[PDB]
Amino acid sequence: DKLNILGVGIGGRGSSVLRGLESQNIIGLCDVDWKYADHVFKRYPAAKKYNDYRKMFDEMLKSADAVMVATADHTHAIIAADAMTAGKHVYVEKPLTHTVYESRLLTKLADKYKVATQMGNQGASDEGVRKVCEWIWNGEIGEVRKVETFTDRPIWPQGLSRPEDDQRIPKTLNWDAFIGPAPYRPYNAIYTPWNFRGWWDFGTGALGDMACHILHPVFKGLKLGYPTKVQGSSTLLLNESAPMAQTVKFVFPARDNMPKVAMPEVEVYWYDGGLKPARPEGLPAGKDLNMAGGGVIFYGTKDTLICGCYGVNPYLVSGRVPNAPKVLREIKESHQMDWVRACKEDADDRVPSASDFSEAGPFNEMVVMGVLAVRLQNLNRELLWDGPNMRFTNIPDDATISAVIKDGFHIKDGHPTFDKTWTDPVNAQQFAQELIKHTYRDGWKLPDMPR
Template identity: 40%
Template sequence: MKPKNQYSRRKFIRNSALAGSAFFIVPRHVLGRGHVAPSDKLNIAGIGAGGKGESDLANFAKSPNVNIVALCDVDDRLGTVNSRKRFPKANFYKDFREMLQKEAKNIDACSISTPDHTHAVATLAAMQLGKHVYTQKPLTHDIYEARILAQAAKKYRVVTQMGNQGGSGDGVRRMKEIYDAGLIGDIVEAQAWTNRPIWPQGVAKPSGNHPVPSELNWDLWLGTAPKEDYNPAYVPFNWRGFWAYGTGALGDMACHIMDPIYRILPIDYPTSAECSIANQWTGMNQEANNVDSCPVASIIHLEYPRKDKKATLKVSWYDGGLLPKRPDELEPEESFGNWDGGVLFIGTKGKLLADCYGANPRLLPLSKNESAKAVKQTIARVPGGTEGHYLQWVNACIAGYGKGVTSSPFEYAGPFTESILMGNLAIRSALFMDPSVSGWGKSKFTGRKKLLWDAKNMKITNFDEANRFVKRTYREGWGSLTL
């Protein structure tokens, strides 16, 4: 009778993208950077062990071919406690830089599930050590960071995946099959929306004296962000609504909801962005506008030149409870997306609607879906769908750079994230006020200004003040993001 672990390994190989490949038992140190010996399990370190990090690590651990060997979190409470109990053999750290230094020989890959403002520095540090990386959405806080991470993945030859699980779902693949079959003609417009934020936005910067919890290293939590006194208004969840740390409703959800647009159509970078926003005001005092916090609600319009040289694609985003007009083809009681949001493709021959994650795609009117049943499946599905997003990355890491496949490698996720963050560039420019002037009617409140984008040079060409938001200056001691 063969040992149980040999059967598990053989079964794994048969069911993964590695099937049909020849295996040789080679030690990890012989293979070098960016490779995992097939005789080994994938040793993963978690940078961010609570919150989303807790569930990410639990999903990776479902694979019998994964060891969680190290954990890092600045806040040893809540989900971090659960992760430490789940993986008692994993060494625990509070500073990911210390962890990477001490565990470099023990880890093959890193899962990064920190607040947005730490994604890029932690991810790049891991890649520079030759570690494969799985980084939560949005890939980065800033446009410049997304560009750098996409370049780094190629330079350091590591397997990458952004945590937008819908990218591995059946829904987006079915949408492409329907589109490729010509049932809605050529897409000329796309609309996407979400119910977020479900955390405070449009609020004033919090103040007050608060003791730092003993379990929290506040200085490490701040990381690249400016020095600021601890406030419980930020942690553990509501940092999402503040520009210093989060990317608001757009950054939180667009990587899920807009993914079908970017994945199906031949686009990469928008040429322009404009927005309208709803924010908290005090009477008629324009200076009470809360520039430190993302707006209560926003509408964003992006224009993309198609790479196939066809007509420009118009994409609109709605959040904070705002919605596009219901399609005339949708009956009054029929659902328009789901609670989390949705996406609508408007074509020259028809319309295609889906829920958040690209789930439940359907033609409008719904009576047309009988014809969609005849469309054959032409695109391979990811085993496990959205949940398979994790195992897909694990399999690709074990296969090695250039051999395994992931749904959202940084080659894809980098430009995708950049295009999403263009919307935030428009929002932050709309909120911009010149601190050198004051008084009603004197501030540079740009309102609905249309920003023109030079993607090659990562530069707004018609409003230079907006370019301050393309790339942050990191706090002293955190360096700068360079390859």
């Protein structure tokens, strides 16, 4: 007796996800690009097709139990939020949302409406993260105070300028439903499909593409919540496009200790774009820190624990392979079909799936927080974050922010010229508020925060 699922954003990842769900009932499909997406729609010949989720939701929500969402980052929130208010379970690809306010909105709506929820970081349903947690929690490495994490991404070009040409909107593409709540701009294929990753207003760069896969063991294993301090630096930082390489450093406060391991204040370093943490003491020359596209090094007082992306293949530098007590549930079905199971339990008995918004909500808040760190970098200050009120506490009321628009380097009869164009300065406090909570384009509205 099957879940009725609507899909929204089916052309890319959404394709393989709907594959997971096929046992069920795909009854409605909604993509904005009927060309990129065609292959999928006619894999599900029985599903009424749409190209604006709001027409689909009007007609078809009354016939649906769940909603899968694999759109570009900046619309996940508003789609998911409209579905939960309607009583509907939602799978939502990672990253969960584009902003911090949105992540917190979703966490609070999941709670309020009592609906199965799942972020699309599927390495949360794998074995490797269960072994990292069961080991740290049995004190196998001791107290953890410094963590280093990295990806090799971006592997596409970032550092892009807004295209200066024109291009007409294809007949197959609903360019307005794509912009959604973001600020409107002239269409170009540099923005979709796929390449939205490197654009501030749509994607979250390497952070959004890879950090939810890489940092999930660090967040669950150290039972992290809100950080207290964050700082970032990067290669040339532009106003519309993410940079080629960034370093971010977070600091989290001490948490309750556990019986076999203490949970002190921990510093979490993130590197990407080629940049790597320096090699741990004890690690063999020649062992690659990258496994499946990234690495984590937990520096512990008694030993050093290393894993790959998706938490794969954890090992201790010393050579010891612990045999710690089993504590986390072993997920037997897939990452998607576990979410399905959760949808069919009554709210009162429901065993949440591995990426329920209760965990992934706050987790995404840390990933997306790294964006704020990198863009506010010119403030030249550890940024102090108050988590419960979603604001920095330590930005002066008269400091300002300016980004580079375009680099103008050129040589001129041998002598060089370092021209550059910069945006108009805005108030740093308002800049920041707006990265944390976006002002939605007219005709686009989130549901209210509860509580």
